[PDB]
Amino acid sequence: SDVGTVIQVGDGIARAHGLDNVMSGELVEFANGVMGMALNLEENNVGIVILGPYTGIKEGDEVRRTGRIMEVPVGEALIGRVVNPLGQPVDGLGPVETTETRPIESRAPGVMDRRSVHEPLQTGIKAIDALVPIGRGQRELIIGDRQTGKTSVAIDTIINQKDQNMISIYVAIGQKESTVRTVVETLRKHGALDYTIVVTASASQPAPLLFLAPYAGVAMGEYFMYKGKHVLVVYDDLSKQAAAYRELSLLLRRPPGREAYPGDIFYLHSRLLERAAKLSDAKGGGSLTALPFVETQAGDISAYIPTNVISITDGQIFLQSDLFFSGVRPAINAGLSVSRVGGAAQIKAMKKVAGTLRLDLAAYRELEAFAQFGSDLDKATQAKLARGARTVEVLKQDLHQPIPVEKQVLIIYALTRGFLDDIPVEDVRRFEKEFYLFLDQNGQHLLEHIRTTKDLPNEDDLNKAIEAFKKTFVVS
Amino acid sequence: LLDAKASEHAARMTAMKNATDNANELIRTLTLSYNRARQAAITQEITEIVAGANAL
Amino acid sequence: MTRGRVIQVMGPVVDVKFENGHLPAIYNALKIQHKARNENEVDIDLTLEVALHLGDDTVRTIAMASTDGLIRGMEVIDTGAPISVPVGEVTLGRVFNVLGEPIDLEGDIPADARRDPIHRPAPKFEELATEVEILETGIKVVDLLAPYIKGGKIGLFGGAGVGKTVLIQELIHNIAQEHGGISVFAGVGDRTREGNDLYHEMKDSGVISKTAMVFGQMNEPPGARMRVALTGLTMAEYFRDEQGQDVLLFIDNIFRFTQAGSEVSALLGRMPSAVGYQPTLATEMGQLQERITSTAKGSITSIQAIYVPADDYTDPAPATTFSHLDATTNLERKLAEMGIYPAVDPLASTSRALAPEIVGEEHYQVARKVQQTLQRYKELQDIIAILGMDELSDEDKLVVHRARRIQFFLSQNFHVAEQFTGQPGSYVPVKETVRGFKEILEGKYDHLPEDAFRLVGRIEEVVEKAKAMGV
Amino acid sequence: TRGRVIQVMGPVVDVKFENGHLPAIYNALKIQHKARNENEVDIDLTLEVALHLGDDTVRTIAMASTDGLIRGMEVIDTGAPISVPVGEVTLGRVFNVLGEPIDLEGDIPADARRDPIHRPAPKFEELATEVEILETGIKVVDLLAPYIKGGKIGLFGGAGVGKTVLIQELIHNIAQEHGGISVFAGVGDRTREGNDLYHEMKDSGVISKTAMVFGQMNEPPGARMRVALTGLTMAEYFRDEQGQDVLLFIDNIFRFTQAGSEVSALLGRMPSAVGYQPTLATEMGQLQERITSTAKGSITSIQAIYVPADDYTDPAPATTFSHLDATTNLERKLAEMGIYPAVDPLASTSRALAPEIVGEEHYQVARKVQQTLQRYKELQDIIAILGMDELSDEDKLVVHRARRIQFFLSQNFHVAEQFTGQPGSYVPVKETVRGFKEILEGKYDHLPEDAFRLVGRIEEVVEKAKAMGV
Ligand SMILES: Nc1ncnc2c1ncn2[C@@H]1O[C@H](COP(=O)(O)OP(=O)(O)OP(=O)(O)O)[C@@H](O)[C@H]1O
Ligand SMILES: Nc1ncnc2c1ncn2[C@@H]1O[C@H](COP(=O)(O)OP(=O)(O)OP(=O)(O)O)[C@@H](O)[C@H]1O
Ligand SMILES: Nc1ncnc2c1ncn2[C@@H]1O[C@H](COP(=O)(O)OP(=O)(O)OP(=O)(O)O)[C@@H](O)[C@H]1O
Ligand SMILES: [Mg+2]
Ligand SMILES: [Mg+2]
Ligand SMILES: [Mg+2]
Secondary structure, rough: OOOOEEEEEEEEEEEEEEEEOOOEEEEEOOOOEEEEEEEOOOEEEEEEOOOOOOOOOOOOEEEEEEEEEEEEEHHHHHHOOOOOOOOEOOOOOOOOOOOEEEOOOOOOOOOOEOOOOOOEEOOHHHHHHHHOOOOOOOOOOEEOOOOOOOHHHHHHHHOOOOOOEEEEEEEEEOOHHHHHHHHHHHHHHHOHHHHEEEEEEEEEEEEEEHHHHHHHHHHHHHHHHHOEEEEEEEEOHHHHHHHHHHHHHHHHHOOOOOOOOOOOHHHHHHHOOOOOOOOOOOOOOOEEEEEEEEOOOOOOOHHHHHHHHHHHHEEEEOOOOHHHHHOOOOOEEOOOOOOOOOOOOOHHHHHOOOOHHHHHHHHHHHHHHOOOOOOOOHHHHHHHHHHHHHHHHHOOOOOOOOOHHHHHHHHHHHHHHHOOOOHHHHHHHHHHHHHHHHHOOOHHHHHHHHHHOOOOOOHHHHHEEEEEEEEHHHOO | OOOHHHHHHHHHHHHHHHHHHHHHHHHHHHHHHHHHHHHHHHHHHHHHHHHHHHHH | OEEEEEEEEOOEEEEEEEOOOHHHOOOEEEEEEEEEOOOOOOOOEEEEEEEEEEOOOOOOOOOOOOOOOOOOOOOOEEEOOOEEEEEHHHOOOEEEEEOEEOOOOOOOOOOOEEEEEOOOOOOOOEEEEEOOEEEEEOHHHHHOOOEEEEEEEEEEEOOOOOHHHHHHHHHHHHHHHHHEEEEEEEEEEEOOOHHHHHHHHHHHOOOOEEEEEEEEEEOOOHHHHHHHHHHHHHHHHHHHHHHHOEEEEOOOOHHHHHHHHHHHHHHHOOOOOOEEOOHHHHHHHHHHHHHHEEEEOOHHHHHHEEEEOOOOOOOOHHHEEEEEOEEEEEEEEHHHHHHOOOOOOOOEEEOOOOOOOHHHHHHHHHHHHHHHHHHHHHHHHHHHHHOOOOOOOOOOHHHHHHHHHHHHHHHOOOHHHOOOOOOOOOOOHHHHHHHHHHHHHHOOOOOOOHHHHHOOHHHHHHHHHHHHOOO | OOEEEEEEEEEEEEHHHHOOOOOOOOEEEEEOOOOOOOOOOEEEEEEEEEEEEOOEEEEEEEEOOOOOOOOOOOOEOOOOOOOEEOOOHHHEEEEOOOOOOOOOOOOOOOOHHHEEEOOOOOOOOEEOOOEEOOOOOOOHHHHHOOOOOOOOEEEEOOOOOOOOHHHHHHHHHHHHHOOEEEEEEEEEEEEHHHHOOOOOOHHHHHHHHEEEEEEOOOOOOHHHHOOEEEEEEHHHHHHHOOOOOOOEEEEEEEHHHHHHHHHHHHHHHOOOOOOOOOHHHHHHHHOOOOOOOOOOEEEEEEEEEOOOOOOOOHHHHHHHHHHHEEEEEEOHHHHHHOOOOOOOOOOOOOOOOOHHHHHHHHHHHHHHHHHHHHHHHHHHHHHHHHHHHHHOOOHHHHHHHHHHHHHOOOOOOOHHOOOOOOOOOOHHHHHHHHHHHHHOOOOOOOOHHHHOOOOOOOHHHHHHHHHHHH
16 A cells, blocks of 8 residues: 555654555655655665654654655746745745646756857856856856855856846755845845745755755756756755765665765766756757855865866866965966866957966966076066966956956957056056946947957957057056 | 185085974974874774674 | 653663653653662662654663663653753853753742743744844954954864863953843853852852853763753743843853764764764754844854864864854964964954955955965965075065064953963954054064064054063 | 566665576666556666575666666566677667667667677687887877877876867877777766767768767766676677777776776675775776787777876776776876876886887987986975075086976867867877977077977977067
């Protein structure tokens, strides 16, 4: 039959006897009204994981089979609401009023159902857009140590997506609830919430819901994706998902591994991250795109969980604490940060203006190490040491201040072709702001051409505009 | 010049004596960190092995 | 029969068989009261808390007092509820154990006074309130580099003997006098000597009338130490919600909550993880620390001391608690042995209140410029360890001179240090702390020697301390 | 004679055959169920026998997800191992682990020959070991570790270092000329690179001479292990029966070793070393000892090997080093300096760098470069603490030349057209020897060092300097 009875209850895991027709991955309902998922099926004992408060489930209480595989609610009504991993409203404001459901154990788009990344995702941060570019359908890793700029790069991205017909999801895994309310108030102030969905799994919840939260978040976005509209997803910590499943697998007594992690860490993270794709024109041309985050102890790139995730993604942005405390914010190490799709995900102008800057900012970083040990140097090295210092200052940018792409290409054009060489290093940040003002009042034609064509205007005209501003400037 | 060259050679010699003494002290301090790290790595691997063996 | 029998004993843990169909809930409390019926046997009073339903009508219960003297076949009664702690105005001025009993020898709490449970669900998303204003402690390093926040969580990390408790006593002295509100002091894993010393300090002050104290100390069995933090917080939760008063909660050692759970866990039938810890570390810590929050009804500020097992910040229990805290100061052994009191790491410590709008642009520009000078000198340190400062050139020389000035001018004289060093203490207001750093950063005090910058409060004090030397 | 499921433990399943007619290790089993009621889910599954337990019961590893599996279902015994289409039908197509065509191009007929994936390895009576040199056009490989035609080639590296961007460069150069079949076996790789390669092969026209087996990162572990063996049975048929020479490209053979671990605990095996299977060497040997060039015909085999945690002292790489003929190790420190391809010129080795296998002039120059770069390594410690000006004229001249040699090992590839703008170059071997000899003899030392980065021939370096103004 479809009824069983609980025999062991402890720590969010239970064991039932009976329930003979259950499937792996089913939903099961206890008497209290708390729901559960079956993950193991021995000959006499069904193994069930509890998705709610377990302080009311006693031994010998009944458990009954729903008949459904694990399903997350989807629909247009979820947009602008704060929700649980299960489809349950949290912000107050009443029901979510969804229409249909999707499995959380979907198959990924297969080879021959996907296309190449060819359209940009303009974040509005100079370093990310110029050096480590992001396009629609890419998976991109923000990796770093505590307090380095990870959440801020993710939220600044959502804010600078208002014009495009984008839908964004923010999944908060393991975060203290006060912080999530702070993020939501921040989005509401910048007007971002109108096109976003927030999914919350606070540190007080059973670890199973932490484990289900990322899957629920992609399950919600793929609905839009197969319908054609583009979507972005952010996972606040995948290192806290790894902890949550370590705990669950240790309670279900599966043997340990490297450290105490199971071996099924690679499977867990790949299952999640390979549902991100760019579908082809037959599928209607939608796009998901994904932003995992990963925190590393000692700020170290070489470790188990960091290297596993650095294998599944289509790039990385590694943020360093010594850069951050040394005045470079956003603190991005250009040597360790790479994009595996970089080059196609840029407008034609930015490809021409800024194609090899990332390799160039790595040569400067290495040569600087050598010359701190070289005493006197020659002319070709002093020239390249100058351009490198000027570049690291043009890459600096304060919090909650977006720069449009047309302005990014013009300041990077001055840097690459030598116009910023005369300006002392201290004035490079000031020269940037004055240049944006001058460009808006006078140079509407050059920006018009960039918005119109996605290409660079005639060199003589650009040289004329920039040289004229260099006459107007006043320097220390 | 006689006094200048004589004084330059003596200055390098003590600077070299003190530099060598600082380096040798750092070698004993670093060596102990390596031995403490080596003994911890050999007690972790044996506890993970025995933890899986006790379960199975 | 709702009575049960004991079937097994394993240190802190016990196993109690009950009648079929009548088992306790999973955080429910039990009672053993036994009178010796023969010379061999001994008499007992004990209470226990349910933790797992193990099958065969059995339950596994951790214990709140020592299990020495238990016999299998003893009879166990069921309270029907979680551990219930007396709450209301009657708590003020009193010293308590985990069971709720008064240990102050001033009487016993009237049996009709309302007692509420220890284990209750955490506060909802609709209720929580987020705001920022700055709390002023007069301690230089906190006020510039990592400012504390009203209504937040404040955490003080450090290893054995590195200065956590003296900084807590300085905070009690300044803030609880200025607070105008209720306080709770809760001691999990602390000496039973420091409990008495603090009690006499509070009675002599007259501050006792507005505060309540729970103690469970290093000597107590592992079980009692876990539930003591939860006990202190149910009293504090009544003061924030039903009286509506703002509250301070001070916790003496929160590491001992994780440590105690580790000992009992292996004995409950659980497999290990990481450095021998429990397999439920994140959930157990988070269940306690999510309750300690500001709400629409009122606010709690918690100042917590976190032990680090060795001077190693990679350990599993410290690392998880870093994710829960709004403002954090890390105390380092190296600095303490050099003579820098308090021993705060200027670059590792963080706060959410360091933002132009909250602090003002002058404070923000001064704090960031100080942290940039200190990071350059943490890289120069690798070369000056061997060669000395002959290798350094130009900017390297000027940066090391100013870093030496800054690192000694973050050290202060405390009123609580008077029991150790004969000097008087100093309180430095925030507007004064920022002005001094700027004159050091400009270079206006380049001439004065480094030994005049140690253990002082304001820049005027450095000038008179230099003039005493004449150097 | 049918069977019944008893335990479903994630990836592993257990089946009891009551009659006593049990299957055999490596055999394949079928689960085909149509849903009786609305609650159930339709299932189509293949499973492979791993172990015989006691109570008439067999452990099996699945080749699809065990979602929707219910205790008591029916398992049909094929009586054979997994069988794969082999023949001219394979050419131009993409297949799954079971030989079912993934591509929309069509469906293979049931009249076609199929061969079994498992087979004993070739024997000492009929292996062979002649040496020739395979030209690649990549400066580092062509000088310091020449690939040997008909022999095993290994690219070792940690995450994000340059391994797949090499395989694609070798596929542009070697594929068209080296007439004969090419097989691609993508074990544990992204599905964004599988799609890109299919269109790259369709563009050039290499497809008619190719067959592909793809198993991506998201499959159940069992499918990831048996994807290497599927590619190998196809290449073996072309080597032995047709007799044409053949190329094999296997991407991430570490993902084969890693899968075994995941299934080891649920199979009932005790753990060994750093959480690895108690049978690591034994599985690596069975697979690798089949990939050989016999008296009948030659397989050149080119592999990417993943160094599990940036630790070359790990068991899986250490066990792998014993099987190769030529090896290039990729290092992240070089990739941080921007020297691409990031190949260790000391840790990379080949059996073809022998004075008679490559010539006296080649060998002289190669070992002399390796002395210069080992001398630069020890000298960097002295420079980092004491400073470069402190040292002798011979020490200064070593550092001078070693900087230039290390940057001149970098090269502009055609697959780096997307990553670096510039189009790309092919350097013939004779040219590479001339140029490296000039650097060592000091003729070009007047030029500034930045001119040697990402250039192909030494002629180009002279012009690149002219633009700088020297
Ligand atoms: N571009 C920037 N300029 C200046 N300050 C910045 C910039 N970006 C971030 N910050 C500051 O750096 C810190 C980053 O905090 P944030 O919460 O974003 O980091 P995090 O790594 O997510 O922290 P946690 O590890 O607690 O999650 C804050 O002080 C933030 O205001
Ligand atoms: N501000 C200070 N000025 C001078 N001495 C201090 C100061 N703070 C601490 N000390 C000295 O250092 C020690 C600090 O003792 P304290 O109890 O605060 O350490 P602790 O870290 O709390 O110890 P434990 O880790 O055992 O709980 C004592 O020896 C004390 O005299
Ligand atoms: N030859 C090259 N020229 C220029 N850039 C390169 C070159 N090789 C690699 N890169 C850069 O480094 C990245 C490395 O990507 P690659 O595919 O080689 O990683 P990988 O070693 O295959 O990773 P995995 O081990 O997961 O397969 C490229 O996407 C590009 O940014
Ligand atoms: Mg964050
Ligand atoms: Mg103390
Ligand atoms: Mg690859």
